Design an enzyme around this catalytic site. Structure first.
Site, PDB file in Angstrom:
ATOM      1  CE1 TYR C 159      -1.967  11.579   9.566  1.00 47.31           C
ATOM      2  CE2 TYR C 159      -3.423   9.671   9.690  1.00 47.31           C
ATOM      3  CZ  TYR C 159      -3.203  11.021   9.865  1.00 47.31           C
ATOM      4  OH  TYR C 159      -4.208  11.846  10.315  1.00 47.31           O
ATOM      5  CG  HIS C 209       0.473   0.211  11.765  1.00 45.98           C
ATOM      6  ND1 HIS C 209       1.657  -0.034  11.099  1.00 45.98           N
ATOM      7  CD2 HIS C 209      -0.385  -0.763  11.381  1.00 45.98           C
ATOM      8  CE1 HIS C 209       1.522  -1.113  10.348  1.00 45.98           C
ATOM      9  NE2 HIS C 209       0.293  -1.575  10.498  1.00 45.98           N
ATOM     10  CG  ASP C 313      -1.860  -9.092   5.600  1.00 41.18           C
ATOM     11  OD1 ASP C 313      -2.635  -8.326   6.135  1.00 41.18           O
ATOM     12  OD2 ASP C 313      -0.738  -9.320   6.057  1.00 41.18           O
TER      13      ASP C 313
HETATM   14 MG   LIG Z   1      -2.576  -3.550  13.938  1.00 39.55          MG
END
Ligand SMILES: [Mg+2]
Ligand SMILES: [Cl-]
Ligand SMILES: [Cl-]
Ligand SMILES: [Cl-]
Ligand SMILES: [Cl-]
Ligand SMILES: [Cl-]
Ligand SMILES: [Cl-]
Ligand SMILES: [Mg+2]
Ligand SMILES: [Mg+2]
Ligand SMILES: [Mg+2]
Lengths: 401, 401, 401, 401
Positions: C159, C209, C313
């Site tokens: 996306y 998200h 990360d």
């Molecule tokens: Mg998340």
């Protein structure tokens, strides 16, 4: 200095009917030879709006410094002591928009740039498909899809007319009649048929237009949920909007309301409590660009989006203003569109039109509309009875229109 | 067209210390030779703000169209995924303010005019009177009164220093010590003495500066009520602001808070629920003019007023921006003022100064400040330990500073 | 005595990029020759975090007694007056974790033992399966199932990407584009396909998200309910989390949020009002182990569970810390896992790895990670543009990423 | 490894009465020859607590790994299915404290260091001044002031005794009688007299000890407000604490409660809703250090402070534990103190004592108390009737004691 006072030297109003709707536009002239236009269009009471502009706002405003839009708005808003309301606010709106037009021209910037620039490339548009049978409705939808629209307001059937056309008591009170249960059933039938035929090809919108009693509205909104509308609009009249509390706790149908609003107490709690998803204020009904920006920012704080009411009964000045606001405001969502007729284009130059299903930024300084005073003269106001505002259920009860 | 893209061709940051406080200012250059200035002043972490501007915002912004302030703000705000916070937002603020400066210059309008013009003649100012005894405090107050001030922030005693100066346990943890009960008692003594001497001649302000535990804060605010302060400020730290619910139901002392805020979740409920009277946001801490306008409008919807934090540790660019916002916004209430020293005036030209207890509109196009790059070079950042941010009660507990 | 002061003799930071992500780790040295490591990894602004550690935290901390972790945390947290935020808190986190590492080594106990010992045998792990088609997704799922995973985060489609890849207005603003309706429809298609194929063999997770407007998020979460996810994550951005009130009253989909949080006012009401099921804080974003323990206990009081954000990360130091917290805390639920690459394993020794779908207790004293200063030197920070944080819907609106 | 299992090899309990109060202490032995002590002191039912430890907890715990304090606590807490309560929780507490003692010894750290180190230099202490006349009360206060106390719990008059001592109906039901109106009037008289004599020299505390009906409690707490107590304690019994809602909306008197609590549902809403300022839990009544840390952190999230109940009927083991918790926890406020008699000091070695009005950190590893099994043998439990728990108002109503 970099900037001198901009003195108001005239205020004029024009009540005209180029096509189907009575419009009211306002023109503010200045000592700098820079004039601004504003929309005061309240199609049902245009002569009353004109009275307010000519008899009351003109003498209040003459000689004032047009640069101080914020102060002038505050002055106008409370000038008659009693305030708010559709006639009051439309008159104020025409002035406020014209002052913004003037400021944009002095800045040599289109209005959206003067406000802080764009928040998007272009605003999506939605059109209206209405027919009394599914086949004709599909033909309208097909045409809009080919034109690039991804959002279409859909209505099946017409909900008004002579009491002879449905079962009523004898000697029915005169009015425009419909049956709420038939309206709900027919509309759900439409949702299902469109979903089966078109699926995800576009998103439907639908306007309930305050046709329902409160529990009916809640049931109907729940029933709309499986159809994934972009929004369902005006399920309740403004003074019964608190009934949304029951709906919101059991349904996630997207809710839009507000085209009828002309008093901040209509929306204060709705917005604060996130009881609507889209605010549909009619900019001239809330008093112009100045209060519209504040309302959009209040909504944004709460995550509420904006979809200004942009019906056929709006002047091209009001249409242009909405386009600038929609390009600039981060929480603007969609721009309602109805095609502009030829006589109107004869009087107003510069009107925006959707391209491939979007409205793009307008680039002329200020609002961007020019008004032909001479052409306007050929189109005086013409009285309309608008019987649809006398809406009745079969028993004869006068309901909200 | 009336307006072409304004391409960003450089972004520079300057961390400097002309006088007592480390400042950070940002300069944005354009292809049109029009440059803008912004304030990114976070006096405790200036080198970190500079890192963000130079290493991250510059490459993000190079080549973008500065006309689109709203879109650029939205881009910057979420660019590091994680967001908000004092270093993040100060960096963003410097850019956002500079873009507004550029837009004002292109429009040839002072910032307050570009925003919509004035809402008042001039904004009232308040000064600060602080002394360790009443006599010296009265002398400060007398001087300000003669100068035309009608609002004065008053503090009696100093609340910090070596643990040797009060009763503590042995071998106290190093820090800046004070006694909360002594602070409250001394301040109430001050309120009473000032009221008896000066009565209605001016309105006191007082800053509690988050010195208190929650119940102490509530008691102290109640005790302040008879003294009719303009506002009582920062009675609670930002994460215990919900304790205001208990205060507000039993006291009408006017409450100001928000200078510490750098995340909308700090204020969202406070404003929505009218739990404060004055919002005291530091504009650069919330990310610049773009979010400040939205916040001011959200506050206005709720009847909450604005008093932007304008301390000694603000650059003249930030000071000028607050002046424009205060002239324009209908709900702006007062402008905190501290005198500007000579070295600072050597680097920044055009800083506003209060006249007869008010700040008047600034008339140069844009923000109105000029920055002397060469003079700035003589005043590099100098590290400060700022021990007052290690504030402790006598037992050694580290409290909010 | 049984315990002497542990004096801080150096504070060092290392911004490095062994593999795909910029990492920041902190090392605290002591007079006892016992050093600790901490994670300050904020991958988007590593140079700014390093500035804070080197220029501000080092001089603050030099000479202090590392034994007093609680006091040092309190000091660091408010040291710049303004506080919270991603850069501020990551810098603090590296120090706080290093002090806990030191304390564990002095105690000769692994961190989970120092904290009070285990609450479980091992913490369940979840992996990530992402593909642009169902067949490839099934192959990923099959592999994880064979490896012993009973929890898998699933995503179908990507996306983001060039505006050329979908319908947009002409001359679209640059950014990473996607269509929210396509995202929702494709994801529901995925849920249904996985359920039909795998049934009860494992539990799906899915991360929204913050891709959606508030009403879209509510509808989507409702639609996820039949699929019995372990949790649905980040359906709303942090400043619109109050919209959960409408969802929670009509849906029992399990809700996780919090990886974005770096200010207690983001979670205070959510946790107090039981509006989320899982708290997903990123430990370094909230300031380290000290505040993480308090937050976990606050959540536990309310019956809210913990699932610390453990993405690719994160440094191996941060990964190890999460493992210890997950073994110790009674309300820890699951540990997000992504495989560690070879270069990273070259710089960090001792990283935990899942075994048969669980992470087991780590047994070395302290956190358990060793850092190779010399190897790290070969992997300097490398600037990344991360265009996905410039996420736009087709009209060009910049949305939360 | 750095750490091997620590196997429980015995569990012993000691019910003893060295001085005025029945105490219960628990000793846990291990395969490492490291033993821990815990406090299970519930002075009214010591034999019942001993039954639970000896007959039920010992066989449950034998052979378990003492390192896993968290898991063992969770196991003990629900082991009898039905749970909470004063006898249940005191038994659990003795074990939990002993395991923490063992962990501290293995770490070679005092308990406060093992937990994360200090949050302050020393915790302020408060003593108790009680007399049946003001003169004798002043003499007690004077002595404490000279000793360095800045906080003193004050009570004027005694509220119990034979019904012959006040007006009652004939043939009164046996009990310890007092008059609520006399209690309130006498106490307000005391507040006023102390304030007039001592002013700001120290802060009073007062314990209402659930003597009042709900409206009486609210009126009395309001009446206490002008006297600026450090806190007013136990104005309501635990099952009528919701009546605080009415008080809190009209009064800012600081409120402490919780010494009676032994079930989380007693405090969950009080803490979540910030209806108290100080939590006064008795650590052994809530099940030991493990749940005390969680409760302190929950309170801290809400800004509620801690003042653990530390009466004369606590063992020196419980006293030491409170001292460690008070040094470590950032939200600890004050430590209640009563002098320890000689026989008790003969059985327990290492008890902390206030110095100049503060308790300082204890430095021996673990909790720091040694128990003399042989000396304890000389002080068996002795039955007490404690008639004060049969408290009656004049009409004979049995009220909460
Ligand atoms: Mg998340
Ligand atoms: Cl419709
Ligand atoms: Cl930050
Ligand atoms: Cl002050
Ligand atoms: Cl996902
Ligand atoms: Cl029991
Ligand atoms: Cl008492
Ligand atoms: Mg409509
Ligand atoms: Mg302040
Ligand atoms: Mg008590």
């Amino acid at each position: 200095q970099s900037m001198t006072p901009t003195i108001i030297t005239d205020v004029k109003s024009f009540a005209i009917k180029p096509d189907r709707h009575n419009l009211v536009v306002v023109k503010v002239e200045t000592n700098k030879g820079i004039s601004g236009l504003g929309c005061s269009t309240f199609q049902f009471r245009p002569l009353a709006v004109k009275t307010v502009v000519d008899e009351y706002l003109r003498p209040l405003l003459m000689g004032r410094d047009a640069n101080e839009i914020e102060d002038i708005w505050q002055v106008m808003n409370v000038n008659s002591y009693w305030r708010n309301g559709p006639i009051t606010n439309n008159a104020i709106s025409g002035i406020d928009m014209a002052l913004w037009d003037i400021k944009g021209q002095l800045a040599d910037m289109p209005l959206y740039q003067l406000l802080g620039g764009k928040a998007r490339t272009a605003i999506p548009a939605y059109t209206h498909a209405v027919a009394d049978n599914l086949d004709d409705l599909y033909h309208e939808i097909d045409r809009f899809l080919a034109a690039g629209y991804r959002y279409i307001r859909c209505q099946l059937g017409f909900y008004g007319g002579n009491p002879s056309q449905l079962q009523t008591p004898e000697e029915p009170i005169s009015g425009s009649y419909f049956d709420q249960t038939d309206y709900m059933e027919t509309t759900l039938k439409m949702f299902a048929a469109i979903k089966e035929k078109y699926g995800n090809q576009f998103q439907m919108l639908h306007d309930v237009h305050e046709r329902l009693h409160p529990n009916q509205a809640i049931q109907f909104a729940k029933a709309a949920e499986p159809y994934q509308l972009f929004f369902l609009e005006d399920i309740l009249p403004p003074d019964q909007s608190h009934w949304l509390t029951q709906l919101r706790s059991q349904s996630a149908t997207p809710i839009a309301t507000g085209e009828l609003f002309n008093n901040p107490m209509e929306w204060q709690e709705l917005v604060k409590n996130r009881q609507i998803d889209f605010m549909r204020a009619h900019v001239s009904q809330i008093g112009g660009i100045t209060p519209a920006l504040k309302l959009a920012h209040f909504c944004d704080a709460m995550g509420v989006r904006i979809a200004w009411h942009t019906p056929s009964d709006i002047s091209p000045v009001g249409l242009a203003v909405n386009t600038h606001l929609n390009i600039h405001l981060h929480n603007a969502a969609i721009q309602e569109t109805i095609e502009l007729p030829a006589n109107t284009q004869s009087v107003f130059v510069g009107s925006p039109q959707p391209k491939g299903g979007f409205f793009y930024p307008m680039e002329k300084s200020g609002i961007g509309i020019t008004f032909d005073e001479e052409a306007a003269a050929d189109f005086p106001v013409v009285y309309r009875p608008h019987e649809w505002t006398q809406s009745r259920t079969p028993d004869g009860t006068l309901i909200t229109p």
